[PDB]
Amino acid sequence: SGVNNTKKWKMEFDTRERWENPLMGWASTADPLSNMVLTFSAKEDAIAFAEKNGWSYDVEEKKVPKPKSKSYGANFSWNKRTRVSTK
């Protein structure tokens, strides 16, 4: 339920082949540029950083959760339909 990994603007890159090393069973690659996390602080700065190196950025926006009303007593209504069971 912890959410500190949010508040940031990681800019990982796409993935490419990860073949199986036929000797050991190991996994190996060609693209060194795959494990390339980068922590930013605002989206307006990220595009400025990637455009500054010409890379075809592809943004996804924030997904803010709503502020929800959760009233404990409404679990225990006379009229209504939220009458919980098992306390």
Partner: protein
């Protein structure tokens, strides 16, 4: 004790149990004891109504309650795993549960436990081969004053000596329920040889009316 089912044959959800129609007619009094909605609230006496038609509430009888009430079956077990008054295991005829908390312990209930244990075979919490007595070490019973204390499925025997327990059980095996009540003569909770509070005929009606 284990608080979960193990679908034995004698305790499977197809055993013979069903409320006699006298008992159905007792339900609709209890569901008109509680409002139209919230008819799922009668679970305590209703499920206890089966306890009195028979001990050892089977899995099937619990599931019957859901049928009369259309409550989820799981919400039946929740109650029956919780309260100690009910009985899910095959119990005896008498269910002689006893206090062992401090004031009744302090008044030598262990001897009442020994004399009772010494003469039946049941250590603490199991049956006789006759299926009559199922001793239980329970904790309090409300009558903490009349200090030694037991219970016979609804009754109350109190102020009972180690000698008096022998007097009891010699009757129950081949007799009747021998007068639920205290010994040493104290009526309910008299001061045991001389009463001191009332000592008079109380005041009749309208004594001390504050001008209403």
């Amino acid at each position: 004790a284990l608080f979960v089912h193990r679908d034995t044959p004698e305790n499977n959800p197809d055993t013979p149990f069903d409320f006699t129609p006298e008992n159905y007619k007792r339900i609709e009094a209890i569901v008109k004891n509680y409002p139209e909605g919230h008819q799922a609230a009668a679970v305590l006496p209703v499920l206890d109504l089966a306890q009195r038609q028979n001990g050892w509430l089977p899995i099937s009888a619990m599931n019957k309650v859901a049928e009369v009430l259309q409550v989820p079956p799981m919400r039946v077990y929740e109650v029956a795993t919780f309260y100690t008054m009910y009985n899910r295991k095959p119990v005896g005829k008498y269910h002689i549960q006893v206090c062992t908390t401090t004031p009744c312990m302090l008044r030598d209930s262990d001897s009442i436990l020994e004399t009772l244990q010494r003469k039946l075979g049941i250590k603490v919490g199991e049956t006789t081969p006759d299926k009559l007595f199922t001793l239980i070490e329970v904790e309090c019973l409300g009558a903490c004053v009349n200090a030694p204390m037991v219970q016979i499925n609804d009754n109350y025997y109190e102020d009972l000596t180690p000698k008096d327990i022998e007097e009891i059980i010699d009757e129950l095996k081949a007799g009747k329920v021998p007068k639920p009540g205290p010994r040493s003569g104290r009526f309910c909770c008299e001061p045991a040889g001389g009463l001191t509070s009332l000592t008079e005929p109380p005041k009749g009606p309208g004594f001390g009316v504050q001008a209403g």
